[PDB]
Amino acid sequence: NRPNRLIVDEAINEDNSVVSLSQPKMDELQLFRGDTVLLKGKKRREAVCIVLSDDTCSDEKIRMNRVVRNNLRVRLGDVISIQPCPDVKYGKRIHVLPIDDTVEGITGNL
Amino acid sequence: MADLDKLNIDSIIQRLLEVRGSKPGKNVQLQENEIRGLCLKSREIFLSQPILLELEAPLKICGDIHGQYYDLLRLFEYGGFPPESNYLFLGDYVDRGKQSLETICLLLAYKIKYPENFFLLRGNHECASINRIYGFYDECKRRYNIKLWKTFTDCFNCLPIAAIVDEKIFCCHGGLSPDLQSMEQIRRIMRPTDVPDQGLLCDLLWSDPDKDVLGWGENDRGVSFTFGAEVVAKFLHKHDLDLICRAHQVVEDGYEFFAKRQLVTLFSAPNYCGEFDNAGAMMSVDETLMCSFQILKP
Amino acid sequence: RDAEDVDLNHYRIGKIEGFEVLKKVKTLCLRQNLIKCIENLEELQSLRELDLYDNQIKKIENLEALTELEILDISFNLLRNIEGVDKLTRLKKLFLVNNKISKIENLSNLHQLQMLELGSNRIRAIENIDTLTNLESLFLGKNKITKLQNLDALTNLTVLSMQSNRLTKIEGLQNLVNLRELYLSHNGIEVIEGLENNNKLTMLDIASNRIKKIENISHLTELQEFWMNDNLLESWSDLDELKGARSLETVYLERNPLQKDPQYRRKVMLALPSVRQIDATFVRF
Amino acid sequence: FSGEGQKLGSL
């Protein structure tokens, strides 16, 4: 439907919060190289990341890394809507916790 | 602090001890990356503590050192060098001359090694701005470059404001203020901070303990609000306070007990500007909140 | 033997010996002294430095007789006036700043001089501030006058410092042939002159410059210190010009309105990796 | 699990 739901392509960069966006993508959409926009995924999966400017690494498709797809619970080529996320301020007291299956083996304050 | 930082702290302590009992003017410089890391750590540690600190009794609190390396060294030799004794300067810890840098470095090193045995405060003479205190900004501009000066200014702004001795004696720079209401807004006022021209902290740092006023009035700084005897009495009654420290003045006796031994105007400024032979003194606070007048040379 | 340095720092004694007995004294230090001044200034002909801070004397002593002096540190004194300093043309250094100085004078000219500092005077009076032409470094900051006296005559100085100066009018900056260092913090000048003429400067100070863009910063591939403190910022064209070059080390934006989002700071840091330092926190590069 | 109760990893 809306053009904002660009195809979620594969990103060569291993950075999770970086999406290789085409020059046409960075231009037609209000997508600067340092714009913190919000992407909406499946089952109300909303996240804010950075939009990298890579014209040669994207052809009308948001090149997204596998880590980004796993975190957002989305597949490749998905038409994911992207909206600006300028309301993301510094958290006051954010509770965090490691994953037992993922923090198993990393001793100490890992 | 850190391994390089702790080594530099030990070297500075040794240099100050070797410059102890001699003429003032020590500098105690360092490297570039090491000094940057030490300044960052000191800013983080000072900003970590609240604006209203608490003293650890017993302690040997000095008056206004006026940025004197010789006076600080004499206080360390007599009142107890760090970390063997807790030091809490009332204010005006930095002033004109090339000897305030050594005192600041020694205080930072002592706080890094033992934060419970090191404390200092600023008044009208140790303000963060060259308009009220040019004995730091102008000295740094003449000696060092601007990046280190900016780092030092940020670290000083990231420091605490007041201190208390077992909730008995207030370790203030000057006198009371009419703008100071309670400790809730004092502890809430975190880094950064500075001594203003008028207000509450401005009256604490620039103004002194006034008796010609009742609630508020003019001060010696010309903009500060030197709270009178009535204001100080009301603040002490409401806050259950008993003593308030006063500094940033040329005291002929060094330690003056005002407000009926409720304002110990201890001043460690010896021979202020040469012409004004102000006496030096310290407030020897025992373990049982026993404030003693530890006078020193003028 | 004769002492090579006279230290009177907080001596707590009105009389200082060894000034005439030790004619080899080269450092007559009386900083934060409890005495008025030091006598026998002309008695020791081989005197290099003479420090006198927090001096109780209201006037100088033998301020012109020491024609063989090298450093005259009369700074941070309580003297009413400083006179006779213009007579000694062989004084390689002079420090008489941060003092009372109710009459700043005797600073006309000198033959062999390298350092001069007689600012922070209670009277905004400057006499012949651009008379000599043998200096290589200039420190004209902290000027109590509302305007600069003369700056176009400095064409051989490789270092310019005019920081925190109340001289709102600052002209003649384009008359210098070359200057390795040029500090124009709080100079009161709308634009920086001499950027095309003195383009061999490795440092640049804007200090919240009213100019939107920087004067030829993209073609300036030699300035390693592009500092613009307390910026609004004026515009991003100066930022683009600075980002075009890669031979800069210290870059200050600084404290602009575009730093509210923490992502903006990270994006700016990623965009400009050629700058060794980023304003306050040095860029990881 | 707790929020703003443990001393955090200061930088």
XYZ file of C-alpha atoms in Angstrom:
704
model
C 0.000 0.000 0.000
C 1.935 2.982 1.334
C 5.394 3.552 -0.173
C 6.878 3.741 3.344
C 6.721 -0.076 3.561
C 9.994 -0.674 1.753
C 11.257 -4.197 1.105
C 13.592 -5.443 3.837
C 16.631 -6.535 1.829
C 19.814 -8.098 3.226
C 22.525 -5.810 4.594
C 26.167 -6.645 3.977
C 27.127 -4.674 7.094
C 26.930 -6.633 10.340
C 25.733 -3.573 12.276
C 22.309 -4.243 13.777
C 21.053 -0.627 13.827
C 22.281 0.189 10.313
C 20.220 -0.271 7.138
C 21.860 0.283 3.750
C 19.436 2.650 2.019
C 19.575 3.645 -1.634
C 20.232 7.240 -2.664
C 16.700 7.169 -4.092
C 15.571 5.654 -0.789
C 17.408 8.229 1.338
C 16.077 10.988 -0.932
C 12.418 10.160 -1.664
C 11.929 9.275 1.992
C 12.963 11.755 4.674
C 15.870 9.449 5.475
C 19.175 11.141 6.274
C 22.337 9.195 7.113
C 21.790 10.042 10.785
C 17.997 9.989 11.068
C 16.668 7.920 13.982
C 13.510 6.527 12.383
C 11.123 3.920 13.795
C 10.445 0.669 11.929
C 7.313 -1.367 12.660
C 7.480 -5.154 12.452
C 5.187 -8.130 12.924
C 2.966 -8.494 16.001
C 3.612 -4.888 17.093
C 7.401 -4.996 16.784
C 8.569 -1.367 16.820
C 12.215 -0.298 16.991
C 14.353 2.754 16.205
C 17.690 2.534 14.394
C 19.900 4.437 11.965
C 19.485 4.560 8.188
C 22.798 4.203 6.381
C 23.194 5.844 2.973
C 24.326 3.105 0.577
C 23.010 3.589 -2.956
C 25.051 0.671 -4.326
C 23.889 -1.588 -1.466
C 20.145 -1.022 -1.947
C 17.734 -0.918 -4.910
C 14.381 0.289 -3.531
C 14.863 -2.233 -0.724
C 16.001 -1.698 2.872
C 19.129 -3.842 3.203
C 18.736 -5.299 6.698
C 21.102 -7.588 8.570
C 20.015 -10.962 9.935
C 20.401 -9.659 13.493
C 17.938 -6.873 12.691
C 15.502 -9.373 11.178
C 15.790 -11.648 14.218
C 15.299 -8.788 16.684
C 12.329 -7.411 14.729
C 10.848 -10.893 14.117
C 10.699 -10.216 10.371
C 11.872 -12.064 7.265
C 13.805 -10.869 4.206
C 12.130 -8.623 1.649
C 9.385 -7.625 4.083
C 7.601 -4.357 3.308
C 8.346 -2.661 6.638
C 6.970 0.815 7.218
C 9.494 3.352 8.498
C 8.511 6.495 10.400
C 10.638 9.144 12.139
C 11.459 8.433 15.777
C 12.567 11.790 17.236
C 10.780 11.274 20.577
C 13.439 8.765 21.705
C 14.968 10.545 24.703
C 17.384 9.235 27.330
C 15.786 6.690 29.633
C 15.608 7.442 33.334
C 15.839 3.979 34.933
C 15.795 1.220 32.314
C 15.704 -2.315 33.714
C 17.982 -4.750 31.878
C 18.679 -8.464 32.183
C 20.844 -10.952 30.264
C 19.549 -14.125 28.636
C 20.290 -17.353 30.499
C 20.764 -19.309 27.266
C 22.996 -16.489 25.962
C 24.813 -15.487 29.166
C 25.697 -19.142 29.891
C 29.509 -19.282 29.882
C 30.381 -15.578 29.993
C 31.589 -15.342 33.589
C 31.762 -12.169 35.644
C 29.989 -8.901 34.946
C 29.687 -9.754 31.249
C 42.828 6.252 41.266
C 43.860 4.239 38.199
C 47.319 2.635 38.107
C 48.890 5.566 36.261
C 46.537 7.894 38.147
C 47.445 6.362 41.520
C 51.152 6.531 40.673
C 50.755 10.204 39.757
C 48.813 10.760 42.989
C 51.620 9.208 45.039
C 54.202 11.278 43.153
C 52.207 14.466 43.781
C 51.857 13.606 47.477
C 55.607 13.054 47.721
C 56.327 16.307 45.890
C 53.973 18.233 48.187
C 55.603 16.661 51.252
C 59.013 17.657 49.880
C 57.560 21.148 49.327
C 55.956 21.021 52.778
C 57.394 23.461 55.281
C 58.876 25.534 52.439
C 57.733 28.479 50.310
C 54.471 27.995 48.385
C 53.846 27.900 44.650
C 53.854 24.197 43.792
C 52.116 23.129 40.578
C 52.194 19.298 40.390
C 51.679 18.823 36.647
C 51.181 15.536 34.788
C 51.082 13.894 31.343
C 48.442 14.502 28.655
C 46.465 11.251 28.412
C 47.088 10.494 32.090
C 45.876 13.939 33.174
C 42.835 13.669 30.900
C 41.909 10.312 32.422
C 42.523 11.578 35.953
C 40.349 14.640 35.315
C 37.566 12.473 33.887
C 37.720 10.126 36.883
C 37.753 13.039 39.339
C 34.765 14.652 37.621
C 32.873 11.349 37.711
C 33.677 10.798 41.399
C 32.824 14.359 42.467
C 29.585 14.304 40.462
C 28.805 10.907 42.018
C 28.461 12.435 45.486
C 25.463 14.650 46.274
C 25.686 18.403 46.683
C 25.217 18.040 50.466
C 28.071 15.883 51.717
C 28.569 14.490 55.224
C 31.831 14.715 57.147
C 33.408 11.743 58.920
C 34.233 12.634 62.512
C 36.840 13.315 63.737
C 38.313 15.740 61.186
C 40.650 18.729 60.937
C 38.682 21.230 58.854
C 40.765 24.189 57.679
C 39.589 27.693 56.869
C 40.183 29.533 53.591
C 43.533 28.283 52.296
C 43.383 30.993 49.585
C 45.175 28.671 47.171
C 48.372 28.494 49.236
C 50.584 25.422 48.896
C 52.541 26.340 52.030
C 49.359 26.793 54.077
C 47.914 23.498 52.825
C 51.196 21.706 53.547
C 51.299 23.192 57.053
C 47.710 22.071 57.648
C 48.597 18.572 56.426
C 51.644 18.447 58.708
C 49.760 19.770 61.760
C 46.095 18.886 61.257
C 46.927 15.570 59.609
C 48.013 14.886 56.042
C 45.722 12.810 53.823
C 44.504 10.157 54.082
C 45.519 10.083 57.762
C 43.027 12.868 58.543
C 39.795 14.127 57.010
C 40.061 17.651 55.590
C 37.053 19.840 54.757
C 37.735 23.355 53.483
C 34.942 25.856 54.086
C 35.660 27.863 50.943
C 38.062 30.049 48.987
C 40.284 27.015 48.427
C 41.759 28.531 45.240
C 42.996 32.085 44.765
C 45.640 34.320 43.190
C 49.018 32.635 42.819
C 50.576 29.486 41.410
C 49.930 27.423 44.551
C 46.215 26.590 44.254
C 46.890 23.957 41.581
C 49.005 21.884 43.976
C 46.306 22.031 46.660
C 43.605 21.032 44.163
C 45.722 18.136 42.881
C 46.422 16.956 46.436
C 42.723 17.103 47.332
C 41.765 15.175 44.187
C 44.459 12.559 44.835
C 43.316 12.143 48.443
C 39.679 11.802 47.353
C 40.685 9.188 44.767
C 42.687 7.261 47.372
C 40.260 7.975 50.233
C 37.090 10.002 49.532
C 36.244 9.903 53.265
C 39.445 11.792 54.145
C 39.334 14.629 51.585
C 36.938 17.520 50.996
C 37.139 21.136 49.851
C 34.780 23.963 48.934
C 34.807 27.283 47.099
C 33.811 30.791 48.128
C 34.071 34.297 46.731
C 37.800 33.796 46.099
C 37.595 30.269 44.645
C 34.727 30.873 42.224
C 34.662 29.086 38.870
C 34.653 32.381 36.931
C 37.534 34.815 36.442
C 35.195 37.704 37.310
C 35.174 36.597 40.960
C 38.190 34.249 40.910
C 40.871 34.847 38.267
C 43.512 33.032 40.322
C 42.615 29.856 38.444
C 41.323 30.785 34.979
C 44.002 33.391 34.252
C 46.705 31.134 35.702
C 45.633 28.233 33.478
C 45.426 30.508 30.428
C 48.923 31.899 31.044
C 50.547 28.531 31.867
C 48.551 25.879 30.007
C 46.374 25.717 26.887
C 42.593 26.025 26.600
C 41.628 22.333 26.357
C 43.085 21.515 29.778
C 41.467 24.663 31.178
C 38.079 23.567 29.827
C 38.581 20.086 31.282
C 39.458 21.573 34.678
C 36.438 23.888 34.553
C 34.150 20.956 33.746
C 35.651 18.880 36.566
C 35.221 21.750 39.040
C 31.618 22.278 37.916
C 31.119 18.523 38.432
C 31.985 18.853 42.139
C 29.795 18.966 45.282
C 28.693 22.141 47.068
C 28.159 21.787 50.818
C 29.099 19.443 53.659
C 27.918 18.697 57.192
C 29.693 17.348 60.270
C 27.405 14.739 61.875
C 24.479 17.078 61.097
C 25.846 19.464 63.724
C 28.104 21.979 61.965
C 27.401 23.262 58.451
C 30.588 23.527 56.367
C 29.535 26.590 54.385
C 31.766 29.070 52.575
C 30.319 32.266 54.042
C 27.074 33.081 55.827
C 23.447 32.035 55.586
C 21.103 32.907 52.716
C 17.426 33.842 52.390
C 17.026 31.836 49.184
C 18.048 28.490 50.723
C 14.867 26.660 51.766
C 15.715 23.000 52.462
C 18.053 20.171 51.461
C 15.619 18.588 48.980
C 16.434 21.173 46.302
C 20.115 21.159 47.322
C 20.561 17.423 46.799
C 18.468 17.713 43.622
C 20.868 20.350 42.239
C 23.517 18.006 40.834
C 26.436 18.764 38.514
C 27.120 21.253 37.064
C 27.021 24.222 39.468
C 28.820 27.490 40.167
C 28.899 30.367 42.645
C 26.423 33.019 41.429
C 26.192 36.742 42.186
C 22.876 36.602 44.082
C 20.717 33.873 45.578
C 21.519 31.085 48.045
C 24.768 29.460 46.896
C 25.869 32.948 45.860
C 25.316 34.163 49.421
C 27.098 31.079 50.763
C 30.199 31.564 48.592
C 30.444 35.374 48.319
C 28.504 36.785 51.274
C 29.584 36.190 54.867
C 27.639 35.712 58.122
C 25.732 38.975 58.425
C 24.430 40.529 61.628
C 23.271 43.967 60.426
C 20.438 42.336 58.448
C 17.572 40.137 59.638
C 16.186 38.210 56.665
C 18.252 39.415 53.715
C 20.267 42.349 52.464
C 23.330 43.464 50.569
C 26.690 41.743 50.988
C 30.397 42.446 50.574
C 30.329 41.082 47.013
C 27.764 43.780 46.206
C 25.240 41.358 44.687
C 25.172 38.571 47.263
C 22.438 38.341 49.899
C 24.247 38.288 53.246
C 21.516 36.824 55.441
C 21.423 38.476 58.838
C 21.333 36.980 62.305
C 17.557 36.469 62.214
C 17.671 34.551 58.918
C 20.491 32.307 60.144
C 18.657 31.688 63.426
C 15.418 30.822 61.615
C 17.251 28.471 59.243
C 19.019 26.756 62.151
C 15.763 26.387 64.098
C 13.858 24.982 61.108
C 16.685 22.660 60.002
C 17.852 21.779 63.551
C 21.252 23.246 62.667
C 23.705 24.482 65.287
C 26.874 25.684 63.544
C 27.735 27.203 60.168
C 31.228 27.653 58.754
C 32.339 31.015 57.375
C 35.308 31.855 55.155
C 36.271 34.129 52.233
C 37.145 37.042 54.521
C 40.287 38.615 55.982
C 40.099 37.395 59.588
C 42.545 39.085 61.950
C 42.066 36.225 64.436
C 41.666 33.464 61.839
C 38.775 31.635 63.523
C 35.947 33.878 64.729
C 32.957 32.387 66.548
C 29.843 34.315 65.520
C 26.127 33.986 66.294
C 27.089 32.897 69.832
C 29.503 30.144 68.750
C 27.215 29.150 65.895
C 29.249 30.729 63.074
C 32.895 29.680 63.399
C 34.430 32.032 60.818
C 37.602 29.997 60.439
C 39.963 31.545 57.882
C 43.347 30.053 56.953
C 44.389 33.078 54.876
C 47.830 34.131 56.161
C 48.889 37.695 55.356
C 46.089 38.364 52.850
C 47.591 40.504 50.062
C 50.492 41.314 52.384
C 48.935 44.536 53.661
C 46.001 42.762 55.339
C 47.752 40.542 57.890
C 44.862 38.102 58.202
C 45.436 35.206 60.576
C 45.244 31.536 59.630
C 43.053 29.071 61.493
C 41.291 25.725 61.241
C 38.180 24.140 62.744
C 39.274 20.976 64.569
C 36.073 18.918 64.640
C 36.354 16.007 67.063
C 34.366 12.758 66.976
C 31.688 14.209 69.299
C 31.033 17.332 67.172
C 33.508 19.336 69.271
C 34.489 22.360 67.179
C 37.932 23.640 68.180
C 39.685 26.764 66.903
C 43.000 25.520 65.479
C 44.670 28.861 64.769
C 47.656 29.123 62.429
C 50.193 31.664 61.162
C 49.217 35.019 59.540
C 78.822 31.108 46.692
C 76.481 33.713 45.217
C 72.937 32.402 44.836
C 71.604 32.162 41.281
C 67.951 32.666 42.298
C 66.302 34.934 44.876
C 63.136 33.330 46.259
C 60.928 35.633 48.350
C 57.703 33.634 48.034
C 55.708 34.204 51.241
C 59.004 35.026 52.943
C 57.136 36.761 55.810
C 59.992 39.271 56.079
C 60.086 42.868 54.884
C 63.814 42.805 54.082
C 65.325 40.410 51.528
C 69.075 39.791 51.553
C 71.245 38.367 48.786
C 69.953 40.781 46.136
C 73.204 42.777 46.047
C 75.564 40.287 47.719
C 74.681 37.571 45.192
C 75.193 39.385 41.888
C 74.663 36.068 40.051
C 70.995 35.896 41.108
C 68.960 35.324 37.944
C 65.511 34.456 39.382
C 64.398 37.228 41.756
C 61.164 35.507 42.721
C 58.897 37.341 45.174
C 55.568 35.782 44.206
C 52.913 35.969 46.945
C 55.500 37.811 49.029
C 54.589 39.247 52.422
C 56.989 42.155 51.771
C 56.684 45.290 49.637
C 59.350 44.747 46.964
C 62.932 43.560 46.411
C 65.818 46.022 46.640
C 69.171 46.015 44.816
C 67.461 45.297 41.501
C 70.190 47.124 39.558
C 72.940 45.792 41.847
C 72.713 42.311 40.283
C 73.501 42.883 36.608
C 73.185 39.155 35.786
C 69.463 38.870 36.599
C 67.291 36.876 34.185
C 63.907 36.571 35.927
C 62.344 38.730 38.642
C 58.990 37.550 39.994
C 56.970 39.808 42.294
C 53.373 38.778 43.012
C 51.087 39.980 45.815
C 53.699 42.661 46.457
C 52.810 45.100 49.225
C 54.612 47.954 47.431
C 52.489 50.448 45.505
C 55.336 51.320 43.109
C 58.200 49.654 41.272
C 61.853 49.778 42.351
C 64.628 50.205 39.756
C 62.189 49.249 37.004
C 64.375 50.889 34.330
C 67.948 50.473 35.619
C 68.131 46.727 34.845
C 68.912 47.096 31.150
C 70.350 43.553 31.005
C 67.187 41.856 32.291
C 65.527 38.967 30.465
C 62.269 38.289 32.350
C 60.375 40.941 34.338
C 57.574 39.164 36.220
C 55.867 42.079 37.952
C 52.540 40.272 37.587
C 49.922 39.813 40.315
C 51.281 42.801 42.245
C 49.452 45.478 44.226
C 51.496 48.313 42.728
C 49.659 51.502 41.813
C 51.567 51.990 38.550
C 54.268 50.352 36.432
C 56.689 52.868 34.907
C 60.141 52.685 33.356
C 59.528 49.314 31.693
C 59.965 50.907 28.246
C 63.578 51.903 28.982
C 64.982 48.348 29.080
C 65.005 47.399 25.401
C 66.887 44.143 26.112
C 64.154 42.573 28.280
C 63.237 39.315 26.539
C 60.182 38.740 28.755
C 57.746 40.836 30.778
C 54.882 39.696 33.015
C 52.921 42.501 34.673
C 49.354 41.215 34.290
C 46.658 40.256 36.804
C 47.868 43.136 38.972
C 46.177 46.328 40.143
C 48.025 48.498 37.603
C 46.085 51.740 38.013
C 48.356 53.291 35.329
C 49.439 50.832 32.638
C 52.261 52.514 30.726
C 55.986 52.287 29.887
C 55.254 49.761 27.150
C 56.253 51.840 24.127
C 58.908 49.808 22.299
C 61.901 47.528 22.765
C 64.790 46.239 20.668
C 65.268 42.689 21.996
C 61.919 41.561 23.415
C 60.174 38.198 23.065
C 57.448 38.093 25.749
C 55.179 40.882 26.974
C 52.216 40.758 29.354
C 51.082 43.955 31.092
C 47.311 43.561 30.863
C 44.523 43.343 33.434
C 44.944 46.992 34.422
C 42.335 49.048 36.252
C 42.778 51.762 33.598
C 42.129 50.912 29.960
C 45.172 52.791 28.635
C 47.495 51.400 25.954
C 50.580 53.280 24.729
C 52.327 52.175 21.520
C 51.146 48.550 21.460
C 52.345 47.988 17.869
C 55.636 49.916 17.770
C 58.267 47.154 17.674
C 58.638 44.766 14.737
C 61.046 42.152 16.154
C 58.449 40.002 17.944
C 57.453 36.510 16.817
C 54.576 35.687 19.206
C 51.741 38.028 20.188
C 49.504 37.794 23.275
C 47.035 40.689 23.038
C 44.216 39.028 24.971
C 42.457 40.402 28.046
C 42.584 43.979 26.761
C 40.746 46.371 29.074
C 40.272 48.866 26.227
C 36.945 48.781 24.404
C 38.821 48.592 21.084
C 42.182 47.354 19.853
C 44.958 49.898 19.375
C 46.725 48.486 16.306
C 46.966 44.998 14.814
C 47.868 45.607 11.151
C 51.510 46.334 12.031
C 52.062 42.715 13.160
C 53.263 41.122 9.926
C 56.161 39.006 11.260
C 54.512 37.396 14.303
C 53.774 33.681 13.956
C 51.516 33.500 17.037
C 48.469 35.673 17.771
C 46.486 35.474 21.020
C 43.606 37.898 21.599
C 41.324 35.712 23.730
C 38.910 37.118 26.334
C 39.682 40.673 25.215
C 37.224 43.532 25.705
C 38.575 45.212 22.551
C 35.401 44.957 20.469
C 36.979 46.598 17.411
C 39.717 44.362 15.994
C 40.966 45.226 12.501
C 44.144 44.823 10.495
C 44.113 41.030 10.812
C 44.595 40.724 7.033
C 47.800 42.806 6.992
C 49.937 39.940 8.322
C 51.968 38.085 5.707
C 51.919 34.818 7.664
C 50.964 33.628 11.141
C 51.286 30.040 12.347
C 48.991 30.664 15.336
C 46.037 33.060 15.505
C 43.531 33.110 18.379
C 40.533 35.409 17.932
C 38.298 34.338 20.818
C 35.866 37.078 21.905
C 37.595 39.530 19.568
C 34.371 41.355 18.710
C 35.084 40.932 14.992
C 32.173 39.822 12.822
C 34.438 38.018 10.333
C 37.993 36.686 10.465
C 40.417 38.645 8.287
C 43.647 37.269 6.874
C 42.263 33.802 6.128
C 43.427 34.053 2.504
C 46.589 36.004 3.365
C 47.680 34.036 6.450
C 46.473 30.605 5.342
C 49.418 28.768 6.962
C 47.722 28.656 10.378
C 47.285 25.239 11.985
C 44.759 26.544 14.543
C 41.588 28.610 14.223
C 39.293 30.070 16.888
C 35.785 31.278 16.043
C 34.281 31.505 19.547
C 30.589 31.571 18.536
C 31.305 33.326 15.257
C 28.378 35.224 13.772
C 29.429 33.958 10.333
C 27.241 31.132 9.051
C 30.013 29.338 7.178
C 33.742 29.287 7.820
C 35.912 31.507 5.626
C 37.479 29.032 3.179
C 37.590 26.005 5.483
C 37.172 23.396 2.721
C 40.318 24.673 0.982
C 42.044 24.995 4.385
C 43.752 21.595 4.602
C 46.271 22.728 7.240
C 44.309 23.933 10.294
C 44.330 21.119 12.860
C 42.389 23.176 15.440
C 39.052 24.429 14.081
C 37.399 25.611 17.283
C 34.017 27.384 17.363
C 33.003 27.499 21.022
C 29.469 28.142 22.310
C 28.055 28.091 18.793
C 24.328 28.579 18.194
C 25.227 27.102 15.642
C 25.132 29.713 12.892
C 24.855 27.242 10.000
C 25.939 23.801 8.806
C 27.911 25.143 5.826
C 30.938 25.628 8.080
C 30.450 22.032 9.236
C 30.385 20.807 5.629
C 33.507 22.827 4.805
C 35.316 21.362 7.824
C 34.179 17.845 6.878
C 35.517 18.346 3.349
C 39.102 18.499 4.623
C 40.937 15.697 6.425
C 44.022 17.390 7.954
C 42.199 18.747 11.017
C 42.705 17.405 14.539
C 40.690 19.561 16.971
C 37.160 20.492 15.881
C 34.645 22.342 18.059
C 31.116 22.880 16.769
C 30.394 23.719 19.670
C 27.369 23.294 21.974
C 24.953 23.962 19.126
C 21.173 23.367 19.087
C 21.451 20.246 16.892
C 23.032 18.167 19.687
C 19.738 17.496 21.502
C 19.341 14.059 19.984
C 22.070 11.653 21.148
C 21.892 10.005 17.714
C 22.948 13.321 16.163
C 26.194 13.267 18.155
C 26.957 9.699 17.064
C 26.163 10.535 13.435
C 28.429 13.593 13.569
C 31.232 11.549 15.140
C 30.893 8.851 12.469
C 30.766 11.400 9.636
C 33.973 13.181 10.669
C 36.648 10.567 11.480
C 39.572 12.671 10.207
C 39.401 15.020 13.212
C 41.646 13.733 15.992
C 39.699 15.599 18.693
C 36.013 16.500 18.839
C 35.580 19.684 20.898
C 35.612 18.351 24.467
C 35.624 14.571 24.055
C 38.421 13.642 21.664
C 37.193 11.829 18.567
C 38.179 8.164 18.524
C 39.247 8.596 14.870
C 15.027 -8.318 38.807
C 14.951 -4.715 40.018
C 15.007 -1.187 38.616
C 17.270 1.606 39.887
C 18.286 -0.415 42.947
C 21.680 -1.816 41.985
C 24.705 0.396 41.369
C 24.771 0.128 37.541
C 27.714 -0.127 35.160
C 29.123 3.401 35.258
C 31.149 4.582 32.252
